[PDB]
Every structure is written in C-alpha cells, then in structure tokens.
Amino acid sequence: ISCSLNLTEKLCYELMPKHIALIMDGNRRWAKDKGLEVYEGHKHIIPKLKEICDISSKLGIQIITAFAFSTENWKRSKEEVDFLLSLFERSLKTEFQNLAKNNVRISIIGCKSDLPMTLQKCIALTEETTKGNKGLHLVIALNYGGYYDILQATKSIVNKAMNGLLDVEDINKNLFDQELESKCPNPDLLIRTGGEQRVSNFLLWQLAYTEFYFTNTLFPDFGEEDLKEAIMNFQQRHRRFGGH
Amino acid sequence: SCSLNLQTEKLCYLMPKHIALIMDGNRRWAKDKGLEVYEGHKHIIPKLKEICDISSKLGIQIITAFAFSTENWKRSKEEVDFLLSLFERSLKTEFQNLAKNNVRISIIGCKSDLPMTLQKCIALTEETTKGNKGLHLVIALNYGGYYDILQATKSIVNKAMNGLLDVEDINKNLFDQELESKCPNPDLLIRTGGEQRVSNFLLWQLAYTEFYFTNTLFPDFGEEDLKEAIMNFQQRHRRFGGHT
Numbered sequence: 328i329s330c331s332l333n334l335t336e337k338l339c340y341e342l343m344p345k346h347i348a349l350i351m352d353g354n355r356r357w358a359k360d361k362g363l364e365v366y367e368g369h370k371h372i373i374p375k376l377k378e379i380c381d382i383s384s385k386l387g388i389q390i391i392t393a394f395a396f397s398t399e400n401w402k403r404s405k406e407e408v409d410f411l412l413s414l415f416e417r418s419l420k421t422e423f424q425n426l427a428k429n430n431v432r433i434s435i436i437g438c439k440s441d442l443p444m445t446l447q448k449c450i451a452l453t454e455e456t457t458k459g460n461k462g463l464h465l466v467i468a469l470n471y472g473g474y475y476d477i478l479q480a481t482k483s484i485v486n487k488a489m490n491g492l493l494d495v496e497d498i499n500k501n502l503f504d505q506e507l508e509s510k511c512p513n514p515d516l517l518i519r520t521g522g523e524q525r526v527s528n529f530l531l532w533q534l535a536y537t538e539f540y541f542t543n544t545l546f547p548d549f550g551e552e553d554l555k556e557a558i559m560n561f562q563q564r565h566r567r568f569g570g571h
Numbered sequence: 572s573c574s575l576n577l578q579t580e581k582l583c584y585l586m587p588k589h590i591a592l593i594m595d596g597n598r599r600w601a602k603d604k605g606l607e608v609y610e611g612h613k614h615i616i617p618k619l620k621e622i623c624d625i626s627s628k629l630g631i632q633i634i635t636a637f638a639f640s641t642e643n644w645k646r647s648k649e650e651v652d653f654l655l656s657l658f659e660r661s662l663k664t665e666f667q668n669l670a671k672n673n674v675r676i677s678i679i680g681c682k683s684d685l686p687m688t689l690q691k692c693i694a695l696t697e698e699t700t701k702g703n704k705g706l707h708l709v710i711a712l713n714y715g716g717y718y719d720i721l722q723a724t725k726s727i728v729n730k731a732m733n734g735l736l737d738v739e740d741i742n743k744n745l746f747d748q749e750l751e752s753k754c755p756n757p758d759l760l761i762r763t764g765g766e767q768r769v770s771n772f773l774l775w776q777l778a779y780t781e782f783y784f785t786n787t788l789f790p791d792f793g794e795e796d797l798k799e800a801i802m803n804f805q806q807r808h809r810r811f812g813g814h815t
C-alpha cells in the first residue's frame with residue numbers, strides 16, 4: 328500500500344474556544360485533604376460540571392466533552408467501581424432538571440453495554456429527552472478511552488470494506504473523523520484538574536492540535552474564576568498548526 | 572457490540588526507557604540572536620546526537636524525535652527545500668563513525684514524498700547503523716499521528732479483504748503491531764520551544780506518557796536541561812487508571 332501526504336487535510340479546529348475538553352481528576356485527594364469520607368469528592372462531580380456548563384454557555388462555548396469514567400478505571404476495586412457507577416446514576420437523576428432548563432443537549436460516549444442496565448436506561452432516556460435542545464452540547468465520556476474509540480472506528484471501516492462500501496484508498500482523515508464517537512469539531516482547549524501532566528487515554532486522535540491547560544486545582548475546587556483564567560490563558564497562545 | 576471490563580491489562584509502559592522528543596523552536600532561536608532564518612535548523616541533528624550520547628550513558632534505550640510533520644508541508648517551498656537539503660547534509664556528516672556503541676537509526680514517516688537524494692541518504696544511514704548496539708534513535712520525518720493510525724487501518728483492511736484475519740481479532744495488540752512506532756511506548760515526552768501541545772506527534776503511543784514542556788528553544792537544550800527533565804519525570808506518580 329502506497330502513501331502520499333504532501334498533496335490538503337483540513338483540521339477541524341478554530342478569540343473563544345468552540346469546544347472544551349475536561350479531565351475531571353483529583354476527587355479522591357480533595358476528600359483526603361479535607362479529612363472527609365473516601366467518595367465525598369466524587370459527589371461534587373456532576374454539580375460542578377453543571378456550573379461549568381452554565382459559565383461556558385454564557386461565554387459562547389458550544390461543546391464540552393468531560394471525562395467521567397475511563398476504560399482503565401475497571402482496574403480499581405469492585406467496591407469503588409460499584410459505588411461510583413451508582414453515584415453517577417444518582418447524580419444524573421438529581422441534576423437532570425438543572426441541565427434541561429438551560430437547554431443543554433446531553434450525549435454519552437463509551438461502551439454503554441458494560442454499564443449496569445438501570446444506568447443504560449437512564450442514559451437512553453436523558454439522550455432522548457434532550458436531543459432537540461439548542462444550547463451547549465455536553466458530551467460525557469463514560470467507559471470511554473482513545474484506544475477503544477480508534478479500535479471501534481477501525482472495525483466499522485473493516486466491515487464497510489467487507490460489504491463492498493469502500494476501497495482501501497478511500498480511507499483518509501475525513502472518513503476516520505466521521506467513524507469516531509467524538510467528532511469534528513475537535514477540542515480547542517483541554518483542561519485537566521488534579522495536577523497530572525498527561526492525557527490518560529482520553530481523546531487521543533481528537534487532541535492532535537488541542538491546546539493543553541494543566542492546573543494544580545483539584546476538581547471540586549475548579550470554579551468560575553479558574554475557568555475564566557484557563558480561557559484567558561488559551562486566548563494568549565499562538566496556534567500555528569505546523570504552518571508559518 | 573463492545574466489551575471492555577474484562578481485558579484490563581496489556582499496554583507497554585526509576586529511569587524512562589523510551590523518551591519522545593519534539594524538537595521545536597528553531598526559527599525563534601535564530602531570530603532572537605539575529606542570525607539568518609535557517610541558522611537554528613542547522614543545530615537540529617548535531618544537538619540530537621549530543622542528546623543520544625548523554626541518554627545512552629544514563630541507560631535510556633529509545634529516543635523518538637520529531638524532525639518534520641505532515642502539516643509542515645504547509646510552509647513555504649523555500650523553507651521546506653532548504654530544511655530537507657539540510658537534513659540530508661547533517662545526516663551524512665554525523666552518524667558515520669565506526670564505533671559500535673553508537674546509535675542504531677530508523678526513520679518513520681512516508682519516505683516516498685522526500686527528495687530522491689534524501690531517500691538514498693536515509694537508506695544508507697539505516698543500513699550502516701543496523702548492527703550498532705547502543706540507543707535506538709527513531710527520527711520522525713514526514714510523520715504524523717493521523718498518518719500512522721490511517722496506514723495501520725489500511726493494512727488491517729487489506730488483510731481482512733484477503734482472508735488473512737477476522738474482524739473479531741482486531742484489538743489493541745494487533746493494532747499496535749501495525750503502527751510505525753510500537754510497544755514499548757514513550758514514558759516521557761519532552762517538548763522544547765514553549766508550546767503546550769502535541770502537534771499530531773505520537774497520538775496513540777502517548778496515551779499514558781508523562782508530558783514535560785520547557786520554554787528552552789531546542790538549540791539551547793543541553794545536558795543540564797535533559798537531566799532536569801529526567802529528574803522532573805522521577806518525581807511523578809503514574810497510576811494508569813488504578814488506585815492504592
């Protein structure tokens with residue numbers, strides 16, 4: 328198979344970020360620091376995420392993709408996974424009407440069939456109720472990883488080729504983008520709370536020219552002032568996309 | 572159909588075994604010092620050799636260095652022609668000594684797009700060093716993350732088309748075996764030049780890599796800067812999605 332790359336590919340990126348990506352990290356250490364019970368940080372996840380949607384919506388931000396549960400988090404104890412998947416279902420039922428009144432559209436990416444059936448039904452109902460809403464699109468990545476996303480797009484392309492729907496030479500960036508679960512437009516800014524300088528198998532393909540913002544602030548402490556700082560910082564960067 | 576909660580292992584991550592290196596900021600280093608526009612680029616592969624020598628003594632086994640991306644074709648024909656001729660020159664003048672403790676050199680990227688003379692220089696550099704026993708230097712030249720994932724997808728589609736694999740055999744390990752940069756993946760990414768972004772480097776391979784961004788322009792990056800980056804790496808806690 329031949330290659331040629333000096334022919335051309337448009338990058339689906341942008342004053343203001345259109346799409347923000349969010350790694351919601353540091354919730355355990357936030358509870359350890361305040362001497363609270365082990366899962367009390369995670370109880371702030373969905374409420375804070377609603378606060379961030381509110382602020383971002385007013386600034387003209389159109390998309391937020393938030394990392395809620397990765398495919399490697401299955402490595403944690405049965406007790407933690409069960410507690411936090413139950414907590415996610417509960418919080419999604421508690422803050423739903425707050426998200427719905429702001430005209431937020433809610434989508435979930437990840438492998439849903441591995442989740443508990445009650446959470447699968449709750450997710451399907453949330454997506455149905457909000458699919459027509461016209462405000463900010465909140466995408467929640469739940470049992471998601473970049474490896475998984477690329478693998479399921481590759482399988483989808485293989486099956487199409489098997490059924491006579493495409494040739495090997497039709498496989499390009501545009502086709503791949505439309506087979507991934509996180510699509511164009513790609514994140515302009517990634518904010519990771521919790522102090523770690525790494526991506527932890529989040530949106531690997533989608534982050535090719537994303538601007539990174541790592542903060543030391545633990546996620547339950549990330550408020551309107553911190554989001555405003557991150558956007559102003561983003562506005563101070565020069566994006567060249569390989570050109571001059 | 573998908574399932575991800577059973578297979579929670581695989582992957583390939585004191586001292587980082589594999590360092591990834593984005594050699595950025597060469598234009599600004601020549602501008603700041605008032606030199607000719609391409610004077611910084613003449614330092615790229617000499618300094619890269621110096622980094623390999625230091626890295627070899629500390630026990631590092633692999634360096635993957637970004638020398639020319641698939642989006643850099645967007646720059647002026649003058650700059651691109653000058654820089655590809657300069658790479659051909661630098662690649663002949665260094666990486667020549669008969670010492671067996673020197674680096675083994677591979678090139679990843681689409682070589683057929685490059686000037687014929689540079690193609691011949693690359694072939695000669697890979698042949699003369701294939702027996703060397705030191706550090707494996709991989710030079711990423713006309714390379715990008717999209718390109719790497721796309722060519723692996725095309726190779727998998729081809730095999731499936733020709734009866735050589737099943738769609739249900741497609742997993743992380745088979746995909747990894749089709750990429751140009753394979754397991755083991757970089758433990759540490761060092762980007763010189765002030766920008767906090769990845770610019771379509773090793774997208775799949777950087778899933779759990781530790782990021783180290785420095786403002787030092789690449790021609791000023793020496794032994795003290797490398798020792799600082801390794802020290803910073805050693806103070807980091809890698810969890811790979813797990814706990815306790």
Ligand SMILES: CC(C)=CCC/C(C)=C/CSP(=O)(O)OP(=O)(O)O
Nearest residue numbers: 351352353354355356395396408411
């Ligand atoms: C939904 C499940 C099972 C887990 C939560 C995943 C999550 C929110 C991770 C980021 S916060 P976490 O890694 O728990 O907290 P730190 O150890 O980083 O302080």
Ligand SMILES: C=C(C)CCOP(=O)(O)OP(=O)(O)O
Nearest residue numbers: 567568569594638639640770
């Ligand atoms: C080939 C190298 C060293 C990496 C790309 O850096 P660029 O200078 O092309 O990256 P951007 O700032 O354009 O993102």
Ligand SMILES: C=C(C)CCOP(=O)(O)OP(=O)(O)O
Nearest residue numbers: 594595596597598599638643
């Ligand atoms: C090898 C390549 C293409 C990048 C080197 O630095 P640049 O050419 O990007 O210079 P700056 O604009 O970053 O200073």
Ligand SMILES: C=C(C)CCOP(=O)(O)OP(=O)(O)O
Nearest residue numbers: 351395396397527810811812
């Ligand atoms: C927010 C989510 C779902 C993942 C956060 O990163 P992790 O806490 O899993 O990442 P590592 O620090 O283990 O890389």
Ligand SMILES: [Mg+2]
Nearest residue numbers: 352353354521
């Ligand atoms: Mg964490």
Ligand SMILES: [Mg+2]
Nearest residue numbers: 595596597764
């Ligand atoms: Mg640059």
